[PDB]
Design a protein around this nucleic acid. Structure first.
Length: 122
DNA sequence: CCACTAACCTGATCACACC
DNA sequence: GGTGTGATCAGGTTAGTGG
């Protein structure tokens, strides 16, 4: 069970490509500003820039420093809750992550990263 | 039927706090 | 140097979009 896939409007597509053309490695500030200007949540914008670099790099292989997101602070209380969840299921779907986001107060996009990191190291 | 791609993934690495 | 862990990189996989 994954998040429902959105569909770019023509005006959104134009804005993402034009910003990608100026810098394919935007920082959190550029992603946030672009996300608000076009009405899309920032994680979807980040996912698009990653997919779009994948398209461009694979295409160029057949032809040819902006600031990061601030480190999310995770309390021991939040960590213990995600830990207990991680033991029952290491691959929570969108609904289980929204649950964990609700119970922890952390954004769901950070829960997704937390599980990606945890599975690679534990 | 099938090309395209958002969503999601692995694995490695960056970045930074901390000792 | 060593450890821990959140964030991001390249790029492969899963599944929804729409020709």
């Amino acid at each position: 069970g994954r998040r429902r896939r959105l569909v770019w409007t023509p005006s959104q597509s134009e804005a993402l490509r034009a910003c990608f053309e100026r810098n394919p490695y935007p920082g959190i500030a550029t992603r946030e500003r672009l996300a608000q200007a076009i009405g899309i949540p920032e994680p979807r914008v980040q996912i698009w820039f990653q997919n779009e670099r994948s398209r461009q790099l694979r295409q160029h292989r057949r032809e040819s420093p902006e600031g990061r997101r601030k480190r999310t602070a995770v309390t021991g209380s939040q960590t213990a809750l995600l830990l207990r969840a991680f033991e029952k299921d290491r691959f929570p779907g969108i609904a289980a992550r929204e649950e964990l986001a609700r119970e922890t107060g952390l954004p769901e996009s950070r829960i997704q990263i937390w599980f990606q990191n945890r599975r690679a190291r534990h």
